[PDB]
Design a protein around this ligand. Structure first.
Ligand code: ATP
Length: 216
C-alpha cells in the first residue's frame, strides 16, 4: 500500500503515511525544506506552532507532516502561492491561486493571469461547495481573516524570505470548521529584514476576504 495523496497543486511526490493523520512529502531537489523547518523551530517556535503543519520527523528524503485535511469530513482546499515565484510574476498581482477543490468545474487555469474581478470570482467559486448558508460562509471567512491578520502582523518580525510558500485554505462542506496554514519551505531563505512581498500577498488576501465577508 502506497496511497497517493490527493494534492491540490505542485509536482512533489506526496503519499499517505502508513499511519493516520500523516502525509509523507519527498524532498526532491535538496533538504532545504527540512533545514528551514528546523531553523524556524529553533528561532521562531511561536510562528511554527500557530501557522505551520507539524513536522513529526524525517525518513531518508521523506518529511512526515501533519495532514491538514485529516480532521475534515468533506474538506475543500485552496492553495494560494504567497511567496515569490521562481521566475514568473504572480497570476493575481500579489499572489497566485495554484488550485482549489472543484476548480475544473469553473475552468480554472493556473497559468491564466487574472483581473481583480476574476481573482475574486475564483475565491467565490472555491466557497460555493460551502453552500447557501451565507452566515456559515461569513464565519469561515472571518476565521480566516482572524488568522491571516495575526500572520501578517507576526511576519513583520521574521527575517526570512518566504520564496515559494503557499497558504492552504480548508473548510468542511458543512462550514462547521476551517483553517489556513503556511506550507512548502523548500525555497525559503535567511535574510536580514522581513519579507514585504509576502506581507503584501497576505494583506491583499485580507482585503479581498474582508470585502467578501461584508458584501450584502
Ligand atoms: N501538510 C499538508 N497537509 C495537507 N495537504 C498538504 C500539506 N502539505 C502539502 N499539501 C498538499 O500538497 C500540495 C502541494 O504541497 P507543497 O506545496 O508542499 O508541495 P509541491 O509544490 O509539490 O513541492 P516542492 O515544489 O517543494 O517540491 C498542496 O497544494 C496541498 O494540496
Amino acid at each position: 500500500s502506497i496511497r497517493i495523496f490527493p494534492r491540490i497543486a505542485g509536482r512533489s511526490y506526496i503519499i499517505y503515511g502508513q499511519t493516520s493523520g500523516i502525509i509523507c512529502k519527498r524532498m526532491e531537489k535538496s533538504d532545504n525544506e527540512f533545514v528551514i523547518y528546523n531553523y524556524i523551530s529553533e528561532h521562531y517556535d511561536k510562528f511554527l506552532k500557530k501557522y505551520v503543519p507539524k513536522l513529526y520527523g524525517k525518513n531518508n528524503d521523506m518529511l512526515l507532516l501533519e495532514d491538514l485535511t485529516y480532521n475534515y469530513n468533506n474538506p475543500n482546499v485552496m492553495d494560494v502561492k504567497i511567496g515569490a515565484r521562481k521566475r514568473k510574476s504572480h497570476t493575481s498581482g500579489f499572489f497566485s491561486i495554484r488550485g482549489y477543490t472543484n476548480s475544473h468545474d469553473y475552468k480554472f487555469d493556473p497559468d491564466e493571469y487574472l483581473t481583480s474581478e476574476s481573482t475574486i470570482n475564483h475565491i467565490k467559486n472555491f466557497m460555493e461547495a460551502g453552500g447557501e448558508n451565507r452566515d456559515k460562509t461569513k464565519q469561515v471567512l472571518l476565521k480566516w481573516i482572524m488568522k491571516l491578520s495575526e500572520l501578517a502582523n507576526d511576519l513583520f518580525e521574521i527575517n526570512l524570505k518566504f520564496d515559494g510558500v503557499s497558504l492552504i485554505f480548508i473548510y468542511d462542506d458543512d462550514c462547521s470548521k476551517c483553517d489556513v496554514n503556511v506550507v512548502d519551505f523548500s525555497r525559503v531563505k535567511l535574510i536580514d529584514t522581513n519579507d514585504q512581498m509576502t506581507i503584501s500577498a497576505v494583506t491583499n488576501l485580507i482585503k479581498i476576504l474582508s470585502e467578501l465577508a461584508d458584501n450584502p
